[PDB]
Design a protein around this nucleic acid. Structure first.
Lengths: 738, 370
RNA sequence: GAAGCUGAGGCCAGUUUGACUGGAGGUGUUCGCCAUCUCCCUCAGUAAAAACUAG
RNA sequence: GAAGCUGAGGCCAGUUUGACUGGAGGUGUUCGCCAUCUCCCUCAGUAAAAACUAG
DNA sequence: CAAGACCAATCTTTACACTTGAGTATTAAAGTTACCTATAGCGCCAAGTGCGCAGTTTTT
DNA sequence: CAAGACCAATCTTTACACTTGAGTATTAAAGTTACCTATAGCGCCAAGTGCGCAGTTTTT
């Protein structure tokens, strides 16, 4: 490595911040300038004070402390390996030993020196800069030679892309002339001038006479060594000159650094500010791809070996980005060699830095990694879900219009493996999230045996929550009692009614409440019923019926190019009363396009529609004994589950509820034939349902608080989830912005 | 925004119901009388305990919860502060090559109540709580203060064991924290403080912490508010120090990082307890001999069962002790993992000890069911 | 060991039967001979640097 | 006045004709009981805050 | 008696050695440095113009 | 015993009073402040869901 740690105490927006475990690529994300620019300012100030530049001291986070400290730990293991060896008796190695490693090995005895040599040791050098209240600066190492040498060995290069200069390439030369160590001091500039003017002269002297005349005319400063080397290099190069222009500038910068550092022991640290600014997304992805290609082409491992491959450590690259494309490409290409840093705000307003897990052991997840997955890294609050219906509901524009707080939460569907290797808890990240799952993932009910059985994920949750089996006593006893009740859930048997459709005495709502209360500390919320079960509730049945009326009255058209003769012929052939179902089947059909019909045809269609609506209401209220049976039938017909958590396919395979299944089949094949294509889970009936419902209630009432109250009454559970999420969002927003 | 408690704040949030009668009847809130305070004796020290039934306990607890926790402090105070710990008090001295440790004699007994009033005055509104008889600040000080019947000469005294004494001590000593921090930093010395125990470390190669000048200067700074240095506890050493069991060591010179470990004295009791548990000596003897925990016969809750009660109590004490020492050692391990300053061989020894503790705890919990 | 400091003597006054201590007063004060107002002789021996020669 | 500090007693060992002091050793050392390796009983009385519940 | 705080330059800036990519006991050559100075009132000598080398205060 | 160094805010920024150009004993109104919060595990009560108020180490 190059830098082991950076620690800032009581400076700018930092209270006490320690950054370590630096990888080869460090991606910095978060809310803008909540400490990003402050960290950059801290690093720049430390490296400016390292080279004895007169720069203004930084401000204190709170004036109730006398000083602020910046501690840099350099990893000098490789340099110790470089110099302690006998072969390299050069002047530079000798000076490096006398400066950095002496006064720390002198104190040691022979045994400890041997132990340090022989062991697989790591050597560190800690330098602390302290700013007092009266602007004075104190170093923990009082030798300026140490500071200058540390500045040389670990140079800091800052590249800003917004204010980049596409025609000023001076940093390129200042970088290349320094990186590769050519000793032109031994080559006299007097000898070099005589040498070059000996050669390039057309006549030996003619060029020299011209240059001597110029020099006698022009009053020039003596050449500095860096100027000499820059002249050398860019004269020998076959070219001095060189949105996409900034990309090329940055890409050549990184290529030069990575290529040139392979032969040197100097390991620079490069910080890039918004590399993607002014870049097409494909251009940013290609920039990261080119950087990775340069990185891996020069990489030597146990497999890749040969001339042209080195084991020299690579420079440490920080870059602060705001685009998911850069982050996605980094994560995909760099694997285990990158780190993602998240910047947020504490309670007292100070900056908080976290490391988000971006390394995945599942290669499939790395390959399928796309823009949507990389977007979650910028999320303020995540609502992980399980199916597409949840995404359809929680993303509904009309619903989120009435709840602006929930508009800041990103809803993402996560599989069990995806959730296992993405979730913030395992990533120890401070991006708050909630995992919304159904209660069926823990307990499965058997009608034949009338018994609940426990799912493995419930056992895993119990094992995670039973951490008190290895510890002492405190106020956690109620949790143990709840876990005991969860254990007793297994042995209990419960009787069913109507061949396994309803529970005699048991309320799954109470068990769901207990599970949610217990597991809220694990950030998982368990909804009592499915989303399609939550929308189809007893309170919203009128509006649901209204919706059906709408899809009959407005979304239906006539299946004939000649409405008049068609409607007359099927009025004649099929009776309005005794044959309403086939008449409606032949006459009406669902169609996006609504051709204009005649007044008589429109009146006849309206009359048939009203008659069919009355018939359907009568038959719905007649065939089903109670409203609960109606709700259950509608839920199953759309793919839902009963109070016993059984799907229509599950019942068909098992063979229970034959009468209810046949009734639903009769309704779908006779009365609800038009709504059959919308019976599927992916039909998008949720969006139309919610849009019509919210528009209708807005027509009913004109107050925003009142409309929220009505929506809460209609969908108690979905609105409860939304309100809990919004309250948590506001709490964590006060945790960040408050 | 600086916290400001006014009359409405005291009436609604702080007093609640504890002093409703005194606030509606416009009667002055009275001093904490000797009836509410019991005096325990621990060695040469005397501790003051207030009864929970008194309204003073409730108002003191709510004062800790809502008012004292919001006043800013100095970063050198690592004791009784949200997020502070002893390990955090020792950590900044790993970079030092010489160490010095000083103590303050009778820190809580020497805290003048006048200094407390001057410190808490800017954070409390200058109003009259009760007519024109008693001020709000004086009522709050009545809540926090006490007069020791043993020593009536000093009058108002902040006693150890109260609800609010530690935080008030930190706030009143923030002034000296700032002064000493400024002095030490201008001298290049890392300074930290835990209660009355001050630790200084010099990372450079110098004899500053060993000279009498440093002690004289710290005493001179402490003399401003009337404190004194306990000369029996003054320690100064090079390249390592053994502070109350915790050993800091830093042999190197320029740019060296020290290591914090635990001496064999700290590990002595836990190692002996593990050995005794492996030796199958009964739980009663283990609790009595090493832990000094016992079930006095006067403390038996019910007379229905005695022997099984004593067995369960001794098992509970043993499980609690093992859990507590395991928690202490994982506190050390987490501190290492987050700061990387604990000795590696000591980390290995800790891991072995932890595995032994977990094996013994599993054996105990298994024998519980037999 | 804390040095305090001064060149060696010859009257006269004050303390001493026989030798040692000072040679305008007032006023104030941090009591320092410190500040401000007014009005003893002899003989040695005396290195260097620096400022200053009103305007 | 410099406090040094500890709860009150009941055997046994060391110093005392009759009462007071300790109840693994080795090694090194800043000599601090400080660090590291190996292997007495009883009875009182026990306030508060803070961290920590491996991974 | 006894001690933490024991100037600022000294020419400066850059920098791998060994056999071409990894390496377990102690600074330096080199380009520029990069340009400096004899002797100020008094004495010797040509002999009154020109050339060579008896204060105060404060520390004390 | 004995002492120089005795926090940082506290709302903040601007600024004449008296009779219109010079003047010989001691801060402040005002615009914005400019927005804050009850009650986190345990107990009471409806009676098992929902609402109101027996550890370690260190200081000691």
């Amino acid at each position: 490595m190059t830098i082991e740690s950076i620690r800032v105490k009581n400076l700018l927006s930092f209270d006490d911040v320690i950054l370590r475990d630096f990888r080869d690529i460090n991606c910095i994300i978060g809310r803008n300038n909540v400490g990003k620019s402050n960290l950059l300012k801290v690093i720049r100030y430390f490296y400016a004070k390292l080279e004895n530049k007169k720069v203004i001291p930084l401000d204190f986070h709170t004036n109730y402390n006398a000083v602020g400290e910046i501690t840099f730990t350099f990893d000098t293991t490789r340099i110790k390996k470089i110099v302690t060896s006998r072969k390299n008796n050069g002047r530079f190695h000798k000076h490096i030993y006398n400066t950095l490693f002496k006064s720390s090995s002198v104190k040691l005895n022979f045994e400890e020196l041997i132990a340090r040599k022989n062991s697989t040791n790591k050597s560190f050098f800690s330098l602390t800069l302290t700013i007092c209240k009266d602007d004075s600066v104190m170093w923990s190492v009082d030798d300026p030679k140490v500071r200058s040498l540390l500045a040389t060995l670990y140079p800091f290069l800052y590249i800003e892309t917004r204010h980049i200069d596409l025609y000023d390439w001076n940093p390129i030369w200042k970088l290349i002339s320094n990186l590769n160590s050519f000793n032109f001091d031994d080559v006299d500039h007097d000898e070099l001038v005589n040498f070059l003017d000996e050669k390039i002269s057309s006549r030996k002297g003619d060029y020299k006479k011209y240059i001597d005349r110029v020099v006698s005319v022009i009053d020039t400063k003596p050449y500095t060594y860096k100027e000499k080397v820059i002249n050398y290099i860019k004269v020998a190069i076959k070219g001095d000159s060189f949105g996409t222009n900034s990309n090329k500038f940055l890409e050549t910068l990184l290529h030069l650094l990575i290529t040139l550092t392979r032969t040197e022991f100097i390991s620079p640290i490069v910080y890039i500010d918004e590399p993607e600014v002014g870049l097409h997304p494909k251009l940013a992805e290609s920039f990261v791809s080119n950087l990775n290609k340069i990185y891996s082409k020069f990489k030597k491992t146990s497999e890749l070996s040969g001339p042209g491959r080195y084991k020299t450590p690579y420079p440490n690259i920080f870059y602060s980005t705001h685009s998911p494309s850069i982050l996605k490409q980094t994560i995909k290409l760099f694997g285990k060699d990158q780190q993602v840093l998240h910047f947020s705000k504490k309670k007292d307003g100070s900056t908080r830095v976290n490391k988000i897990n971006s390394t995945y052991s599942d290669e499939r997840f790395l390959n399928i990694f796309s823009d949507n997955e990389a977007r979650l890294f910028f999320s303020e609050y995540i609502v992980f879900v399980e199916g597409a219906t949840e995404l359809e509901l929680f993303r509904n524009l009309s619903l989120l219009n009435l709840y602006p707080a929930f508009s800041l939460a990103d809803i993402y569907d996560a599989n069990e493996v995806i959730l296992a290797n993405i979730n913030p808890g395992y990533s120890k990240a401070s991006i708050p999230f909630v995992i919304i799952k159904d209660i069926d993932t823990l307990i499965d009910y058997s009608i034949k045996t009338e018994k609940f059985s426990l799912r493995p994920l419930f056992e895993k949750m119990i094992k995670e929550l039973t951490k008190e089996f290895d510890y002492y006593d405190t106020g956690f006893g109620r949790v143990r009692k709840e876990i005991d009740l969860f254990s007793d859930i297994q042995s209990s048997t419960k009787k069913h009614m109507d061949s396994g459709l309803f529970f005699k005495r048991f309320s799954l709502h109470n068990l769901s409440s207990r599970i949610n209360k217990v597991s809220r500390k694990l950030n998982r919320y368990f909804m009592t019923t499915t989303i399609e079960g939550a929308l189809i509730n007893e309170q919203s049945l009128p509006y649901f019926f209204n919706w059906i009326g709408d899809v009959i009255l407005t979304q239906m058209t006539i299946n004939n190019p000649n409405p008049d003769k068609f409607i007359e012929a099927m009025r004649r052939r099929y009776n309005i009363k005794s044959q309403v179902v086939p008449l409606f089947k032949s006459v009406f059909c669902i169609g996006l396009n609504h051709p204009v019909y005649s007044s008589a045809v429109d009146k006849q269609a309206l009359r048939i529609k009203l008659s069919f609506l009355n018939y359907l209401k009568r038959k719905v209220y007649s065939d089903f004994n109670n409203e609960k049976e109606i709700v259950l039938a509608l839920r199953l017909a759309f793919g839902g589950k009963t109070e016993t958590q059984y799907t229509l396919d599950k019942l068909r395979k098992d063979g229970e509820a034959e009468l209810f299944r046949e009734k639903i089949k009769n309704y779908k094949n006779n009365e609800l034939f038009f709504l059959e294509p919308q019976m599927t889970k992916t039909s998008g009936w949720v969006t139309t349902f919610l849009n019509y419902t919210i528009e209708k209630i807005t027509s009913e009432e004109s107050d925003d608080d009142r409309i929220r109250q009505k929506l809460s009454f209609i969908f108690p559970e979905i609105i409860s989830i939304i309100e809990q999420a919004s309250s948590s969002i506001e709490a964590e927003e006060s945790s960040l912005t408050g | 925004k600086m916290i400001l408690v006014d009359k409405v704040f005291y009436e609604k949030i702080l007093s609640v119901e504890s002093f409703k009668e005194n606030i509606i009847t416009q009667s002055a809130i009275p001093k904490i009388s000797n009836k509410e305070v019991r005096l325990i004796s621990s060695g040469s020290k005397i501790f003051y305990a207030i009864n929970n039934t008194s309204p003073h306990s409730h108002v003191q607890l709510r004062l800790n919860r809502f008012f004292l926790s919001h006043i800013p402090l100095n970063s050198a105070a690592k004791a009784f502060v949200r997020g502070g710990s002893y390990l955090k008090y020792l950590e900044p001295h790993i970079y030092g090559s010489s160490y010095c440790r000083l103590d303050i004699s009778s820190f809580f007994n020497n805290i003048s109540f006048d200094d407390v009033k001057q410190s808490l005055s800017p954070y409390i509104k200058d109003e009259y709580l009760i007519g024109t008889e008693q001020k709000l600040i004086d009522a709050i000080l009545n809540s926090v203060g006490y007069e020791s019947p043993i020593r009536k000469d000093k009058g108002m005294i902040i006693p150890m064991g109260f609800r609010t004494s530690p935080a008030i001590s930190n706030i009143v000593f923030r002034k000296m924290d700032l002064l000493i921090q400024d002095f030490c930093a201008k001298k290049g010395v890392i300074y930290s403080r835990y209660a009355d125990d001050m630790l200084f470390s010099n990372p450079r190669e110098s004899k500053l912490l060993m000279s009498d000048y440093f002690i004289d200067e710290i005493s001179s700074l402490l003399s401003i508010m009337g404190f004194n240095i306990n000369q029996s506890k003054y320690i100064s050493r090079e390249k390592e120090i053994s502070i109350n069991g915790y050993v800091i060591e830093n042999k190197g010179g320029n740019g060296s990082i020290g290591t914090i470990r635990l001496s064999k004295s700290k590990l002595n009791t836990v190692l002996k307890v593990t050995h005794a548990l492996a030796q199958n000596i009964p739980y009663k003897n283990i609790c009595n001999k090493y832990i000094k925990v016992r079930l006095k016969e006067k403390n038996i809750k019910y007379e229905s069962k005695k022997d099984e009660f004593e067995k369960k109590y001794y098992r509970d004490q043993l499980i609690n002790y093992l859990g507590g020492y395991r928690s202490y050692l994982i506190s050390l391990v987490k501190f290492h993992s987050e700061y990387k300053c604990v000795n590696s061989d000591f980390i290995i020894q800790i891991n072995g000890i932890l595995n032994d503790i977990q094996n013994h705890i599993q054996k105990i919990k298994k024998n519980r069911r037999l």
